């Protein structure tokens, strides 16, 4: 008797509220063997639950390309650009700057426990991670970065797994 429209309206509101509040609960940073920092769950997440936003600076593809080239000139700067399609254009969330936000610290796997989704709030796209399966406390959060480039895989063989 949660009709379709209502289940939809409630889910939209729930997600919007989480994005807007920026509460990043149920997660902690840890050093992960072979990966640098990573994020570990400190509570159970159920399949379909919001985990965290991939928060950063929203930019357009031409600007993103320029930045990517600039960051590449500094070996101390990591790789935090997340490209995606929205309304017939390509955008990028640039999470390169060190902030307190956790989404940018989540590592890669092809057998991860989170899935990235596009969620728009009044015309502004947001990238969010949702649990793809039940996640137990103590598990490292992981999702598929999606970079299948030969050059990327050559430089970072971990992208293949």
């Amino acid at each position: 008797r949660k009709s379709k429209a209502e289940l939809q309206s409630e889910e939209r509101k729930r997600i919007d509220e989480l994005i807007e509040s920026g509460k990043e609960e149920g997660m902690k940073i840890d050093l992960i063997d072979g990966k640098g920092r990573g994020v570990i769950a400190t509570k159970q997440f159920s399949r379909g639950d919001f985990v965290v936003e991939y928060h950063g600076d929203l930019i357009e593809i031409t600007d993103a390309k320029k930045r990517e080239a600039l960051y590449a000139q500094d070996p101390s700067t990591g790789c935090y650009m997340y490209y995606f399609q929205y309304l017939s254009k390509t955008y990028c969330v640039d999470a390169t700057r060190e902030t307190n936000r956790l989404g940018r610290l989540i590592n890669h796997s092809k057998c991860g426990n989170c899935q990235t989704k596009l969620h728009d709030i009044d015309g502004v796209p947001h990238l969010i991670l949702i649990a793809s399966r039940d996640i137990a406390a103590g598990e490292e959060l992981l999702y598929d970065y999606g970079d299948r480039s030969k050059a990327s895989i050559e430089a970072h063989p971990w992208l293949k797994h």
Binding site: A72, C79, Y83, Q85, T116, L118, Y145, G146, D147, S152
Partner: peptide
Amino acid sequence: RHRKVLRDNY
């Protein structure tokens, strides 16, 4: 160097 790319999940 790498990036991240989202693939269609409408």
